Design a protein around this nucleic acid. Structure first.
Lengths: 485, 730, 9, 50, 733
RNA sequence: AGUAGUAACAAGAG
RNA sequence: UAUACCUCUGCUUC
């Protein structure tokens, strides 16, 4: 019966297989290069590279968050006392007065002598929190009669083009500093040689990440979400002011308590997991928004003084924005230290594979080099159209940054892109290994990938990185094509 | 307490709801109404716990006097609230209530705690009393096998374990007595005495008992050690690229040494065979081999287990050699007679052809099965005599059955009914003889009837027995129940006796390379030599790359100086001995092409140089054996392709990167300039060169059978790797 | 004791 | 019935019968097994003794 | 210098660094609001793939049924549900001729299991559609409401205990003309109070008998609830998943147990193979297909994936599969296994909440239930929903449900559908052409290997597999699937490349805090590290980091920072006292602000066992107080090793039920609980072992307490006073 | 506003 | 209408 059915079945039913060649791999997402579209805006919850933390030398032990922000503003009082608003840039649908009144209410509330960090439920706080904006539920019998009521057409994400602030975020978040931010607790004593190898490996692996920028940005997200979730359940009906805290240690070993800004908690009677609590962020910065205005259409910027940053004077700005989070995303923020393991495992695999080849701990060799071997070098990025060799440390941080950006911009566009693009990745590896790969409906692969490139910065920049990487592989394929033959 | 139960029963029966519940609901349905509740399944407990910990009173409390000893507040901190919980109907409390109870709560009775949770405490002493060894970096093959996770007190099935737990904790509610009670009466007596005075809840004891009785067997990547007290430390023992020598504390089993002892001796022999003077390597290694803590000398001396491989080493070191076989449950020892296995097809009783290895020649053994003992005399498919002793019925029955099956009698083969090709519980086909063992142990009525009977011995000390293991005048044919209860070794590892005969064959050990039970160790330089295929493949090629400077230089000078190096003997122990010379003669000839002619390929030189150790073997013509792939022992993966890359060996000429069993190596800076457009046909077949490119007139891609039969100076087409036609001449 | 470095710091 | 049989045997301190008995005398501390035969009583007696 | 993380793939290949392509540190997408649009999508699409078959109205239910089986074959690559019975039977015959004895043995093993299986088995079904209240409920409650309802219609199969009589009552309850069932309603009653006015009104609930007609009951018995799937990774758009009723559970259990017993012995099925064993199957299956055709034999591996897997496979095929698989078994078991497909063949789909219409002018909103779905002009819905509602009409029912004869739901016949996929792999050749295919199957994800002399033949061998699957109702994804030369492939997010690489990102979410409790989560967190070191390739440094990061997430979640550290909190204020009071500070657990003593070597050891010798006698006595109030009445998916101490607590019950009409179930619960708690005091083994008995629950307690009273008197525990009092109480009972 | 993204929250209920 | 600047609720399904 099988063979008798296959005889009478139409020839049109087939897989239409075609062997994959490199010119069949057209760059993914043709619309991201089109200038007719608007460039993708910064949409993270907090600032990352542009942040500016007000330092404060302390004993190095926990204090109350209000008292910390008070003593930080005590040190840098020139900015705290600035009640004169110098507005630089303004979000389309924002209210200069309300926002600045809010900032002053936060500053003064935190600066006061009393315990509570609660904020008065004002008319400007009710706008920035979005009070009463929920719609009223009514009976089905009424809505059926009311002919003005209709099913809303759904909001579809906008089609954004490539923006260079992502590239610069990546470039800067991956670089080293002099400030360690991680809060890694203690462990048991080492006994077995494996534990002494691991402990010795951590000195190279961990401090490579700890000293870089992305480590402090991550710890900022974690500790903030940790307290932002606590207020969201403890003080539900109460509007509260929460500081953007993070303790830091410099290379000399002195505990600096950093304050990157102040945030307003909304009304948080969060029943379902996806229920939203709107949060309003007031964050310090050194970046002039007029430089990259396409980056900040969601932000409202003031100018509230100046500081001696790197010896010279630098203008301090206040980036104000109405934002939002939910129970889920606050939890995933508390579980965001795991961005270490995903990048530390990936590179310890390369250290263990290299130790297999040469039969001794190749950690120091990979990072620094040694008597026998040179340091491990990777293709790290481009520079005026040619490759650049970065060290093992940099390749470690680049993955750690990529793992942090997977969270900070984590949504359905990322999942759909990563998954469907990973297929087109594997095919390229088969072409690199010359395993004669065949495809059945390549337009289906592209249609499945390209629908996920809308308005996620990390997706749009990864699609650009993917096409630059795909371009450089095509120049290497000119080596293998004429081998032997 | 009985009065309190009946009083609570009367007060409960006042409620017309409870009374109807108690009268209408069955004892079966108890299992339903117990799980009835308003509780919902938490789909995101990671989130819900972080949320619940930010609230005031997330925890629930049991209603009792101990709950009331917690105060409502403590120094301003709200410990608990008046509002009850829905499920418990006790006061809800905060996480601070726990910390208060641990600090200022009532000090309870913890006597018996160490005996209740003994199972866990035995892990602590197995780590505390242990001693660690060396950490070594280098490849490891990991074989994914079902293994026991934690060591047990006495292994049982769940049904058997539950009844034992039931007899310990709730004897009045055990129900029907089982045979397990009589078997494990001392384990019950022990656990009953140990767990008497404790105040901990029975349901906890039943959980801890079920942990140390029922087995947790799960698949895991393992190498070397497979014992439960090693598996529990598996995370620290090994990785994909590193090893850690570990010696756990406490006592270890005798059977566990027997398992590793065999694999150790076999692995010693498999290596020393290829190198001349095998006895020298076998003694050099075996002296410095260790099984966990004991050396191999001590284990072979103290344990009376062994097998073919085991004895051969016992001779090479010293002291006696025990020729003992194990047929499932029957344990034998060789008195006299050396039989020989021969594969034949026997048409067994049920009506099916079966390939079985028959043991020719006469043999005599000292037999023992559990408690019953005896002496066995057999020949080629015949039970000549079977002088056994009187013992328990199941031991006397199974000894006679196992002697009937081990003797390979035709009365046994022609006594099968139905089917006997059943798999085990996991789904693996058992071997011909063990299948008959599993069958006739259960269904013996076909064997006893087809056997036949005869007169019993009329000597006073001798007696006969019938089918039901009782004394009888008509005994089984050949069965009798009686009342009474130097060597040297060759260069090539065969044991000779004073009269010239040979009793142990070097070519008589099993090729099956299984995993050991304890930590196998080689306290020597060059451990890798006693390694798995890929371990030796990867190490060998690393020793090549490490000395590629001098080996490539000396290949232009020293003709056959390199082909034999210390390192390549280990690589040869991988190769099937029936192809070692064929590969060597081919690899040497292809290498000699690149030497004497002006066509070098360093990636190929590295690939074939290890295959050239074993003395070569050419064809009758003088030309070597041509090959597509050079297969190796174990697994279909392990082979080195000549033209293409392969799971073990491939080369990426774009990056000049060599892949050796996954690991990456760089050849950049060690390649000649003319290797850009240098086709591979000039190092694929020995005595062949590329003239032009694929000519359709020559025809199809000619196979090895054609290529070897082609005459010298004759063109032909060859396909290197998929999509690379080449035109080659001899 | 490890102090990472780079050609941009 | 088994809970009764085991509770009696365990409390009195004796072995539990492997089959289910019919009665139990408290004064004798002995389990009892009743049998209702048709023909001879001696036939049904020694068969139970097996 | 512009950094590019994709340039890592120049140096390290994609499989070697596959962990970096999975964004599992980020957030998974959740659903919002109704899933009616996604459910209607599935209804339209399921009929879209079978609309050229046979339409006919079911005289039993009154629904519009569609039948593709034995219909016209497709002439295009659009998903086809038009399977051919003969081709399925031949594929099963080929499977039987190569695996003989399995078909009848699996049926006997399942049949022997069924006879032993009891009714309580159904309580472990998680969420179940309760036909009495038309809501998703716990399985235990849904089962109980059905048994109490069955008792009102004189169907006491559950009283016998076995599953067979209960399943007999289910098919018999279909014939009932009117199915009665309980429904609770409230009553005011003046209870005496000391409240100025001497009384208080407490609304005591009472049960009421309520009836449903034969047809409306059969529809509910055939109905399946729906909802959107939350946290589905690696996908942009969301989709809907279903939930079944209590009737069909017993029949599916058997069919899946039957299909499991088949799948266990098949070598080309990855189900229910543990993820660790799946490599042992795959790597060896690859090793075979490698060394099989040396002479220019191009072995190709196809990374497969099926589209519309559930929406094309028809119950009518699964019914033919049971009839073939149960050839040797008796007639009663053949009728038993046939029921589950028959119900799925005539099933009904519920459409969730509905749609919410609003007016931005007035700031109002309202949900339109599925019954009222069409009580409104279609222009007032949005454009896409307007198109869906028009296509839904022919399959729409008056009471607001969708008829759905063809297709399956997401996760129903996983085993039995794997069998059909293996049956496709069993053909291996068509027309004796120069190739041979083999592979591994697991629901919608398959891995096909194809060996042949030239690749032109391989692609025709794949095409022969494609055209064969079409005849079975199996549709290969031309878009997602791709082919390459053997050596590397992908299968259920497991990446082979001359060996399966480690994919650490997949297991990364599990490293966080689990959410059971302080005691359990500690054990769980260290065990996850231990396991991932072994299986998922985590080195000692990254594992020692995970030891730190877990304690960090553990201490912030449970607010139990070091006692010497000066972090403030309600618990921390008591922890700092406990730190000053206790002498053996290293004996304190982390939950009590103690130090983390864990490392690589002692991951497998519980924390309470490690630090036991370091504790103070008063601390271990309070921490492990036998009768402490925090641990509840315990009763005996991965399990862990931990000690039952004060940190092994349970959280409060969800209190939302208090201000809704389901308050009744609280008194319903506690009424059972009081009986079970007393039954457990009478029978201590009830917590451990399942009690058996068709007799009354009270009788067991009465006899047991009578023996306890008689033995306690004659042994010498109770006096004549307590014995005569006990016999006087029991005499009344 | 904003979160967010094919449908919701921006409190609900008595 | 009122009690209700009150009360209950934060995964509890209609």
């Amino acid at each position: 019966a099988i063979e008798r059915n296959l005889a009478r079945m139409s020839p049109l039913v087939s897989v239409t297989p075609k062997k994959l060649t490199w010119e069949d791999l057209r760059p993914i997402g043709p619309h991201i290069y089109n200038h007719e579209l608007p460039e993708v805006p910064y949409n993270a919850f907090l600032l990352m590279s542009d942040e500016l933390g007000l330092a404060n030398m302390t004993e190095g032990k926990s204090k109350k968050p209000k008292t910390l922000a008070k003593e930080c503003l005590e040190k840098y009082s020139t900015l705290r006392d600035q009640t004169d608003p110098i507005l630089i840039m303004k979000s389309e649908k924002a209210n200069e007065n309300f926002l600045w009144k809010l900032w002053r209410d936060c500053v003064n509330t935190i600066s006061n002598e009393e315990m509570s960090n609660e904020l008065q439920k004002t008319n400007y706080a009710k706008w920035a929190t979005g009070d009463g904006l929920t719609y009223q539920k009514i009976m089905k019998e009424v809505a059926i009669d009311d002919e003005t009521m209709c099913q809303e057409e759904p909001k579809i994400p906008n089609k954004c083009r490539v923006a260079a602030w992502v590239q610069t975020e990546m470039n800067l978040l991956s670089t080293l500093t002099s400030k360690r931010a991680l809060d890694l607790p203690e462990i048991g004593p080492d006994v077995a040689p494996v534990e002494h190898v691991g402990s010795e490996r951590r000195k190279y692996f961990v401090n490579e990440i700890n000293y870089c920028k992305a480590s402090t940005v991550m710890m900022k997200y974690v500790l903030f979400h940790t307290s932002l979730l606590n207020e969201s359940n403890a003080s539900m009906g109460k509007y509260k002011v929460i500081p953007i805290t993070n303790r830091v240690v410099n290379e000399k070993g002195e505990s600096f308590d950093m304050l990157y800004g102040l945030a307003v908690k909304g009304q948080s009677h969060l029943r379902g997991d996806t229920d939203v609590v709107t949060v309003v962020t007031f964050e310090f910065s050194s970046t002039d928004p007029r430089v990259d205005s396409g980056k900040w259409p969601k932000y409202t910027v003031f100018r509230i003084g100046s500081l001696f940053v790197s010896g010279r004077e630098k203008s301090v700005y206040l980036y104000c924005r109405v934002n939002g989070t939910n129970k889920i995303q606050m939890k995933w923020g508390m579980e965001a230290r795991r961005c270490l393991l995903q990048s530390m495992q990936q590179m310890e695999a390369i250290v263990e594979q290299e130790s297999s080849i040469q039969g001794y701990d190749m950690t120091k060799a990979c990072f620094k080099g040694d008597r026998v071997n040179s340091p491990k070098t990777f293709s790290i990025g481009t520079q005026e159209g040619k490759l650049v060799k970065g060290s093992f440390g940099k390749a470690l941080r680049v993955i750690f940054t990529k793992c942090l950006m997977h969270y900070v911009f984590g949504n359905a566009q990322l999942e759909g892109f990563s998954a469907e693009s990973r297929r087109l990745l594997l095919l390229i590896q088969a072409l690199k290994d010359r395993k004669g790969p065949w495809v059945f409906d390549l337009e289906g692969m592209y249609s499945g990938i390209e629908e996920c490139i809308s308005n996620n910065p990390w997706v749009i920049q990864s699609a650009y990185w993917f096409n630059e990487w795909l371009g450089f592989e095509k120049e290497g394929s000119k080596v293998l094509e004429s081998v032997d033959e | 307490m009985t009065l309190a139960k009946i009083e609570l029963l009367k007060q409960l029966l006042r409620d017309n709801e409870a009374k109807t519940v108690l009268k209408q609901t069955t004892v079966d349905q108890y299992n339903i109404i117990r799980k009835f509740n308003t509780s919902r399944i938490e789909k995101n407990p990671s989130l819900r716990m972080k949320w619940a910990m930010c609230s005031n009173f997330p925890l629930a409390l049991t209603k009792g006097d101990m709950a009331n000893r917690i105060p409502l507040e403590y120094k301003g901190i709200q410990l608990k609230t008046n509002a009850e919980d829905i499920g418990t109907k006790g006061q809800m409390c905060s996480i601070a209530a726990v910390t208060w109870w641990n600090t200022y709560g009532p000090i309870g009775d913890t006597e018996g705690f160490e005996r209740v949770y003994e199972s866990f405490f035995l892990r602590k002493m197995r780590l505390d009393n242990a001693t660690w060894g060396r950490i070594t970096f280098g490849p490891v093959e990991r074989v994914r096998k079902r293994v026991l996770l934690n060591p047990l007190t006495k292994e049982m099935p769940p049904d058997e374990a539950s009844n034992v737990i039931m007899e310990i904790l709730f004897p009045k509610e055990a129900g029907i007595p089982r045979e397990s009670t009589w078997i494990h009466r001392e384990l019950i007596k022990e656990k009953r005495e140990k767990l008497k005075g404790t105040m901990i809840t029975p349901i906890v004891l039943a959980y801890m008992l079920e942990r140390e009785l029922v087995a947790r067997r799960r698949f895991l990547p393992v190498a070397g050690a497979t014992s439960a007290e090693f598996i529990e430390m598996l995370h620290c023992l090994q990785g994909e690229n590193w090893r850690q020598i570990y010696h756990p504390g406490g006592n270890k089993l005798t059977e566990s040494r027997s398992q590793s002892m065999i694999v150790a001796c076999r692995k010693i022999i498999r290596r020393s065979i290829v190198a001349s003077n095998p006895l020298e390597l076998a003694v050099e290694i075996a002296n410095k081999t260790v099984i966990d803590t004991e050396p191999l000398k001590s284990c072979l001396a103290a344990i009376d287990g062994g097998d073919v491989a085991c004895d051969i080493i016992r001779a090479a070191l010293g002291l006696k050699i025990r020729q003992r076989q194990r047929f499932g449950r029957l344990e034998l020892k060789r008195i006299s007679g050396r039989g020989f296995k021969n594969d034949e097809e026997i048409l067994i009783g049920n009506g099916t052809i079966q390939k079985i290895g028959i043991w020719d020649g006469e043999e005599e053994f000292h037999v023992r099965c559990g408690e019953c003992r005896g002496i066995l005399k057999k020949s080629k498919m015949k039970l000549e005599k079977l002088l056994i002793n009187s013992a328990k019925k199941e031991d006397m029955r199974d000894l006679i059955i196992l002697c009937m099956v081990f003797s390979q009698d035709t009365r046994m083969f022609q006594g099968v009914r139905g089917e006997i090709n059943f798999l085990n519980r996991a789904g693996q086909l058992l071997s011909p003889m063990y299948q008959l063992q599993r069958y006739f142990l259960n269904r013996s009525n076909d064997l006893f009837d087809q056997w036949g009977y005869e007169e019993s011995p009329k000597a006073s000390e001798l007696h006969g027995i019938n089918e039901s293991m009782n004394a009888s005048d008509y005994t089984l044919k050949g069965v009798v129940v009686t009342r009474n209860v130097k060597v040297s070794i060759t260069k090539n590892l065969s044991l000779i006796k004073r009269t010239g005969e040979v009793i142990m064959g070097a070519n008589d050990v099993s090729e099956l390379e299984s995993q050991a039970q304890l930590m196998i160790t080689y306290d020597t330089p060059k451990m890798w030599e006693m390694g798995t295929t890929k371990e030796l493949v990867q190490n060998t090629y690393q020793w090549v790359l490490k000395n590629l400077v001098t080996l490539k230089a000396q290949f232009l000078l020293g003709k056959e100086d390199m082909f034999q190096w210390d390192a390549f003997e280990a690589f040869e122990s991988i190769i099937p001995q029936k192809m070692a010379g064929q590969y060597s003669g081919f690899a040497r000839a292809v290498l000699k092409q690149m030497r004497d002619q002006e066509v070098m390929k360093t990636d190929q030189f590295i690939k074939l140089l290890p295959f050239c150790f074993s003395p070569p073997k050419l064809r009758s013509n003088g030309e070597p054996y041509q090959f597509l792939k050079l297969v190796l022992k174990g697994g279909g993966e392990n082979f080195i392709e000549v033209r293409k890359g392969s799971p073990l060996f491939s080369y990426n000429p774009q990056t000049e990167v060599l892949t050796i069993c996954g690991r990456m190596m760089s050849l950049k800076g060690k390649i000649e300039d003319e290797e850009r457009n240098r086709s591979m046909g000039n190092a694929v077949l020995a005595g062949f060169l590329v003239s032009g490119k694929y000519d359709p007139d020559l025809g199809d891609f000619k196979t090895i059978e054609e290529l070897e039969k082609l005459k010298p100076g004759e063109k032909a087409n060859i396909l290197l790797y998929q999509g690379k036609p080449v035109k080659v001449v001899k | 004791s490890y102090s990472p470095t780079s050609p941009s710091y | 019935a088994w809970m009764v049989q085991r509770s009696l045997a365990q409390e009195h301190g004796i072995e539990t019968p492997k089959y289910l008995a019919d009665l139990f005398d408290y004064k004798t501390k002995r389990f009892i097994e009743v049998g209702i035969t048709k023909g001879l009583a001696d036939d049904y007696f020694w068969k139970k003794k097996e | 210098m512009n950094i590019n993380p994709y340039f890592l793939f120049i140096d390290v290949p994609i499989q070697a660094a596959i962990s970096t392509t999975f964004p599992y540190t980020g957030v998974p997408p959740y659903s919002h609001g109704t899933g009616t649009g996604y459910t209607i999508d599935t209804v339209i699409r399921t009929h879209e793939y079978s609309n050229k078959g046979k339409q006919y109205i079911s005289d039993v239910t009154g629904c519009t049924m569609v039948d593709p089986t034995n219909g016209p074959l497709p002439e295009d690559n659009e998903p086809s549900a038009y399977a051919q019975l003969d081709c399925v039977l031949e594929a099963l015959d080929r499977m039987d001729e190569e695996h003989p004895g399995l078909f009848q043995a699996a049926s006997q093993n399942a049949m022997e299991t069924l006879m032993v299986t009891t009714v309580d088995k159904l309580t472990q079904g998680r969420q179940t559609f309760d036909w009495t209240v038309c809501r998703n409920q716990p399985a235990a409650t849904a089962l109980n409401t059905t048994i109490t309802s069955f008792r009102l219609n004189d169907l006491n199969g559950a009283d016998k205990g076995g599953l067979i009589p209960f399943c007999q009552d289910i098919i018999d309850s279909l014939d009932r003309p009117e199915m009665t069932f309980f429904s609770v309603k409230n009553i005011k009653k003046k209870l005496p109070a000391k409240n100025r006015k001497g009384f208080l009104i407490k609304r005591i609930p009472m049960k009421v008998k309520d009836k449903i007609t034969k047809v409306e009951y059969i529809k509910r018995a055939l109905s399946l609830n729906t909802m959107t799937k939350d946290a589905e990774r690696g996908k942009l758009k969301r989709r809907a998943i279903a939930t079944a009723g209590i009737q069909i559970r017993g029949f599916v259990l058997v069919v899946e147990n039957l299909a499991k017993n088949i799948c266990e012995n098949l070598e080309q099925s990855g189900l229910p193979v543990g993820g660790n064993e799946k490599k042992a199957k795959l790597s060896n299956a690859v090793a075979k297909m490698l060394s099989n055709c040396p002479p220019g034999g191009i072995s190709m591996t196809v990374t497969g994936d099926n589209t519309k897997w559930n929406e094309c496979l028809n119950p009518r095929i699964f019914l033919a599969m049971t009839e073939r698989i149960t050839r040797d078994s008796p007639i009663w078991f053949r009728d038993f296994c046939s029921i589950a497909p028959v119900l799925f063949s005539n099933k009904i789909a519920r459409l969730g909440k509905g749609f919410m219409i609003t007016s931005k002018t007035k700031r109002l909103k309202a949900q339109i239930p599925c019954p009222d779905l069409f009580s409104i002009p279609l222009e007032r819905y949005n454009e896409e929903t307007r198109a869906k509602l028009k296509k839904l009409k022919p399959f729409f029912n008056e009471e607001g449900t969708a008829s759905l004869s063809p297709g399956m739901m997401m996760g129903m016949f996983n085993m039995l559908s794997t069998v059909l996929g293996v049956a496709a792999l069993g053909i291996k050749n068509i027309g004796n052409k120069e190739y041979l295919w083999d592979g591994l199957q697991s629901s919608d994800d398959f891995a096909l290997f194809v060996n042949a002399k030239d690749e032109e033949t391989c692609m025709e061998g794949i095409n022969d597999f494609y055209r064969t699957c079409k005849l079975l109702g199996i549709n290969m994804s031309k878009k997602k699937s791709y082919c390459n030369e053997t050596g590397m492939f992908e299968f259920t997010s497991m990446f082979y490349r001359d060996g399966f690489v480690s994919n650490f990102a997949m297991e990364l979410p599990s490293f966080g805090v689990a959410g059971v409790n302080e005691s359990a989560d500690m054990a769980i967190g260290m065990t996850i590290i231990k396991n991932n070191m072994i299986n998922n390739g985590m080195g000692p440094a990254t594992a020692q980091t995970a030891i730190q990061l877990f304690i960090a997430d553990y201490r912030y979640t449970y607010k139990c920072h070091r006692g010497d550290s000066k972090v403030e909190g309600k618990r921390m204020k008591i922890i700092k006292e406990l730190w000053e009071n206790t002498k053996g500070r290293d004996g304190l657990l982390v939950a009590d602000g103690g130090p983390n003593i864990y490392n690589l070597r002692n991951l497998h050891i519980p924390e309470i066992v490690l630090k036991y010798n370091l504790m103070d006698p008063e601390y271990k006595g309070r921490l492990l107080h036998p009768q402490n109030p925090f641990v509840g009445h315990l009763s005996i998916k991965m399990d862990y090793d931990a000690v039952s101490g004060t940190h092994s607590w349970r959280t409060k019950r969800n209190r939302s039920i208090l201000n809704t009409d389901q308050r009744n179930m609280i008194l319903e619960e506690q009424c059972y609980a009081k009986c079970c708690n007393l039954f457990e005091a009478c029978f201590n083994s009830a917590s451990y072992r399942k009690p058996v008995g068709q007799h009354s629950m009270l009788e067991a307690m009465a006899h047991r307490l009578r023996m306890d009273a008689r033995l306690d008197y004659e042994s010498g525990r109770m006096s004549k006073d307590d014995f005569e009092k006990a016999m006087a109480h029991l005499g009344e009972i």
